[PDB]
Structures are given as structure tokens and as C-alpha cells.
Structure 1
Amino acid sequence: MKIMQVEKTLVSTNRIADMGHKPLLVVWEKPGAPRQVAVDAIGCIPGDWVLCVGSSAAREAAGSKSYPSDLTIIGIIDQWN
């Protein structure tokens, strides 16, 4: 897992039907780092340092193991620096 800031709220209305519709949040290793993206299982507001799980861990983090997620947000660091 890794602490990553939320930059914006990604929207794709032509995504695979297997995704159902979880929230999506563009994530930042930090501002100025690659804008990777996560399925926001734990609700996070833009401008929030949020820990993101990855691999098969991200998939069962969302509804199902078959769920198509490589990065999921599994929390928000209560206080982060």
C-alpha cells in the first residue's frame, strides 16, 4: 500500500460493465507524480492523503475478487504529513 493524494474524480461512462459503478479517484504519489487511478471503495474527498492497496488485494478490496481493480483506496490516513 502507499499514501497518495487525491487530485480529481475520474469519470468513464464507457468502462467495462464488470466494474458496475464504484467511485473513481485520480490519485497522486504526490502532486507532480504520475496520475495513477484507484476504485474508491472507502469514500475519499479530493485533496485527501489516501492509502491505496494494489494487485489481487485491490480486487477483493472492492466488491469481488473477479472485480477489475489494480489499485483501490482502502482508507484515508487520519493525520498525514
Structure 2
Amino acid sequence: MKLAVVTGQIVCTVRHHGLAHDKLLMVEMIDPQGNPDGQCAVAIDNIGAGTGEWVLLVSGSSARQAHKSETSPVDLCVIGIVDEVVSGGQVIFHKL
């Protein structure tokens, strides 16, 4: 389970049918201080995550299930949309 931000989206008209019509998002991992580093990958989305919002990514089989089932052709899937993050009793990130 890792936190990251949505930096964009990929469009693949010809793609694996097991993908249905869910969106393909460009994601970038976030460091402990709430800042985008370099780790960039593509994750499937079905909860309606937009560009600029922070999310929770899952990988491996945990991703396939979190997507649709054990058939899902994915290794990285967004399982949540972060509303906010708190550290030293001080909110570092809020969804505005």
C-alpha cells in the first residue's frame, strides 16, 4: 500500500478487454513529507480519481482483486481517494 498523486492519464483505444472501460492514470509516488518524488507508473482506476488528487495504490494480486477479480490484467490499482493527511497534529494535505 502506497500513497501517490494523479499527474495525468493514458488513452489506449486498443486495449485488453479485461480492462472494461476503467480509466488508466499516470501516478507519482509521494515522499513522507507529502511531496512528489520520481516513482511514476500507471494504475487502473474505477472510483473516479481526478488529476491532482492524492490516492492509495495497491499492487500485485491485491490489485487484481481490488479491481474486479483474480482475472483483472493489472498490477497497480487505486483503492481510495485521500481527503486529507495529518502528521504532527497538523494537516499536511487536504482535498480542495
Tell me the equivalent position of 2:63: 58
CA distance in 1, matches of 2:5, 2:44: 14
Show the 5 A alignment for 1:32-71: 32-71=37-76
Tell me the equivalent position of 1:18: 18
Q: Which has the higher contact order (CA 8 A, sep 6+)?
A: 1
CA distance in 1, matches of 2:47, 2:66: 9
Higher strand fraction: Structure 1 or Structure 2?
2
- The runs of 4+ residues in structure 1 deviating greater than 3 Å are none
CA distance in 1, matches of 2:63, 2:2: 12
Post-superposition offset of 1:76: 1.3
Unaligned 5+ segments in structure 1 are none
* Number of matched pairs: 81
TM-score under structure 1 length normalisation = 0.88
Secondary structure, in 3 states, of the residue corresponding to 1:10? strand
AA aligned to 1:13 is: T
Identity %: 41
Pairing partner for 1:74 from 68, 74, 79: 79
**Superposed CA offset, 1:20-63 (max 9, x none):** 22111110014441320111122111001101011101101112
